[PDB]
Design an enzyme around this catalytic site. Structure first.
Site, PDB file in Angstrom:
ATOM      1  N   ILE A  84       0.846  -1.186   0.000  1.00 50.14           N
ATOM      2  CA  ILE A  84       0.000   0.000   0.000  1.00 50.14           C
ATOM      3  C   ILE A  84       0.884   1.239   0.000  1.00 50.14           C
ATOM      4  O   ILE A  84       1.964   1.259   0.603  1.00 50.14           O
ATOM      5  CB  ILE A  84      -0.958  -0.005   1.213  1.00 50.14           C
ATOM      6  CG1 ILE A  84      -1.838  -1.257   1.194  1.00 50.14           C
ATOM      7  CG2 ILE A  84      -1.821   1.251   1.241  1.00 50.14           C
ATOM      8  CD1 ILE A  84      -1.443  -2.296   2.221  1.00 50.14           C
ATOM      9  N   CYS A  85       0.424   2.278  -0.693  1.00 46.50           N
ATOM     10  CA  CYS A  85       1.112   3.562  -0.721  1.00 46.50           C
ATOM     11  C   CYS A  85       0.577   4.442   0.403  1.00 46.50           C
ATOM     12  O   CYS A  85      -0.626   4.723   0.459  1.00 46.50           O
ATOM     13  CB  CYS A  85       0.926   4.244  -2.076  1.00 46.50           C
ATOM     14  SG  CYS A  85       1.953   5.710  -2.326  1.00 46.50           S
ATOM     15  N   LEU A  86       1.466   4.870   1.294  1.00 49.59           N
ATOM     16  CA  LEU A  86       1.090   5.746   2.398  1.00 49.59           C
ATOM     17  C   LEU A  86       2.298   6.513   2.922  1.00 49.59           C
ATOM     18  O   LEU A  86       2.169   7.634   3.415  1.00 49.59           O
ATOM     19  CB  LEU A  86       0.446   4.940   3.528  1.00 49.59           C
TER      20      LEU A  86
END
Lengths: 145, 375, 76
Positions: A84-86
């Protein structure tokens, strides 16, 4: 051997679980968590149950937990490996903090401007076609597991 | 020639042209993007195709998403190059608790407000370290360091800031914190009970010392920028404002304008918008701070998810402003000069065709320089 | 010492820095000259991204070196 902060956060995590999300520790290593998030209402993922895997490194809480998707999800912020991109992690945050943000990404799956993967490029141009793909994959991989 | 016409023109042109509103020749964008991206070229197989691989994934013609750069472009257009340079020589004023100083600086004239918002980035981590091993140039910044004879704060510029503790005090703290996991740990742990041990008592005491000293240390760092255009109105009750912004992690000014968020916030009224903006810097409820931050500054449609979970606004914020008057003729001519530049160097029947030519001419200049250094 | 910061639009500015100055120190000096919040800037040296917690010496940035100020975030 677990640090005292991890032990008591786990207890508060189960005595007060974040709504729409259920998370448990692993039987052997208590640093690994099995998560299940419900698909948010009025979203392309409604009616779906999405399983995840969360890990607490030795530097926690000075370092963020490590997350990964288990069930296949069509989302511009999740890749083919479940990543996930965060660099915005503070020790004040906790496990439920990370979970609430992932849940919020399904409630508003529209991609951000910096996102430049092609799942994000498809969601940007033909959003109507991508929303039905997210609806399709929700029925495939997140409605019987 | 009204101030409202100025709003409609810059909104129309940014929506239609995006990055071309800056008047930069496409060859320069491509050449500068080329020298930046020359390292990302794969030098294994076909180099001619490997260079085109970098050009295809280019973003040199997508607009900036830095809030500060967007504010710089708004000022340049409304005030002119010289007028903008004088505007930045002005000094910011901290917004009052209710916003009265800003409400009292809009005397029904064509005005441009520029805003800079800071977040207080106080330290949250500490570590015990011996003086012989403490190197401020390489150690982690924005951190407390508890030595055997001194308590210091290493700020974001790598400077050692003394926190006013004596050697006897630090010697006691240094020697009371002995658990290996607590040598390099966090401040303000919720589970530290100072009545269960001498270690937890020392850790809680150190946290209280740091909190009291940090209230007087400038941990403010600019986190957001935007502008508000307040045109002249006929009535005193017809006047409205228009906020313009981009946002680093989120959107461009073109997307802002395309989503009509300038007009949606304009409907809050001048006193309504200022009330929320003033409340953003005065509230101590991080949930209220988050929702106001989301309402005002999120891209259209993400107001409820912008500052939740990991993006919750836990730190104090302060809002600063500066105001100057706008000449509509200057602004409309600055906008027309950009239109002339666009119509002359990138001709087309509609805006969409001119942007594609601009992108093609930027892409071929990037290819030409990349090949002039790699073929 | 002097270092140069160049943007995509061709603009070049000169910053007065020490080799030991942090990246956040450099972003603050860019804030002083261009009014850009340090939270909304990115600095590049020789194709490599400069992280906020580091210093100019961590990347061997020396006298009259040229950095690149990136004003469009592109990630993931």
């Amino acid at each position: 051997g677990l640090p005292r902060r991890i032990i008591k956060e786990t207890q508060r995590l189960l005595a007060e679980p974040v709504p729409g999300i259920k998370a448990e520790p692993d039987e052997s290593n208590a640093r690994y968590f099995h998560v299940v998030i419900a698909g948010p209402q009025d979203s392309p993922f409604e009616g779906g149950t999405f399983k995840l895997e969360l890990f607490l490194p030795e530097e926690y809480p000075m370092a963020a937990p490590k997350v990964r998707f288990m069930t296949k999800i069509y989302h511009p912020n999740v890749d083919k490996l479940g990543r996930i991109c965060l660099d915005k992690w503070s020790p004040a945050l906790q496990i439920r903090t990370v979970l609430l943000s992932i849940q919020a990404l399904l409630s508003a799956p529209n991609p951000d401007d910096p996102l430049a993967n092609d799942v994000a490029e498809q969601w940007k141009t033909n959003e109507a076609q991508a929303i039905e793909t997210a609806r399709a994959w929700t029925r495939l991989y997140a409605m019987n597991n | 020639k009204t101030g409202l016409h100025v709003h409609e023109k810059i909104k129309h042109m940014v929506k239609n042209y995006g990055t071309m509103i800056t008047g930069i020749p496409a060859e320069i964008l491509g050449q500068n993007e080329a020298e930046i991206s020359v390292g990302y070229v794969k030098k294994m197989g076909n180099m001619k195709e490997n260079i085109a691989e970098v050009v295809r994934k280019s973003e040199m013609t997508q607009p900036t998403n830095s809030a500060g750069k967007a504010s710089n472009e708004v000022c340049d257009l409304l005030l002119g190059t010289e007028g903008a340079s004088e505007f930045e020589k002005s000094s910011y004023q901290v917004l009052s608790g209710d916003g009265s100083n800003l409400k009292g600086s809009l005397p029904n004239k064509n005005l441009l407000v520029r805003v800079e918002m800071d977040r207080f980035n106080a330290p949250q981590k500490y570590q015990k370290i011996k003086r012989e091993e403490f190197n401020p140039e390489t150690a982690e910044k924005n951190k407390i360091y508890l030595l055997e004879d001194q308590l210091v704060y290493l700020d974001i510029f790598g400077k050692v800031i003394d926190l006013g503790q004596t050697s006897d005090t630090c010697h006691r703290l240094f020697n009371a914190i002995t658990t290996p996991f607590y040598q390099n740990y966090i401040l303000y742990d919720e589970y530290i009970d100072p009545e269960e041990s001498a270690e937890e008592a020392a850790m809680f005491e150190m946290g209280e010392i740091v909190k009291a000293k940090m209230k007087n240390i400038d941990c403010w760092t600019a986190t957001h920028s935007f502008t508000i255009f307040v045109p002249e109105s006929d009535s005193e009750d017809t006047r409205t404002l228009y906020p313009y912004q981009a946002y680093w992690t989120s959107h461009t000014l073109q997307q802002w304008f395309s989503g009509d968020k300038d007009e949606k916030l304009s409907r809050l009224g001048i006193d309504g918008y200022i009330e929320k903006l003033a409340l953003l810097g005065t509230t101590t409820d991080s949930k209220i701070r988050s929702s106001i931050y989301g309402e005002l500054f999120s891209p259209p449609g993400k107001e409820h998810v912008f500052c939740t979970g990991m993006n919750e606004k836990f730190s104090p914020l302060r809002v600063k402003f500066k105001v100057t008057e706008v000449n509509p003729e200057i602004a409309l001519q600055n906008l027309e000069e950009v239109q002339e530049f666009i119509d002359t160097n990138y001709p087309g029947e509609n805006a969409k065709d001119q942007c594609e030519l601009y992108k093609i001419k930027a892409q071929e200049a990037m290819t030409k320089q990349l090949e002039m250094r790699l073929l | 010492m002097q270092i140069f910061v160049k943007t995509l639009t061709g603009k070049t500015i000169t910053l007065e820095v020490e080799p030991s100055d942090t990246i956040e120190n450099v972003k603050a000096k860019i804030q002083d000259k261009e009014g850009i919040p340090p939270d909304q800037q990115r600095l590049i040296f020789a194709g490599k991204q400069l992280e906020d917690g580091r210093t100019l010496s961590d990347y061997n940035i020396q006298k009259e070196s040229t950095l690149h100020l990136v004003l469009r975030l592109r990630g993931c």
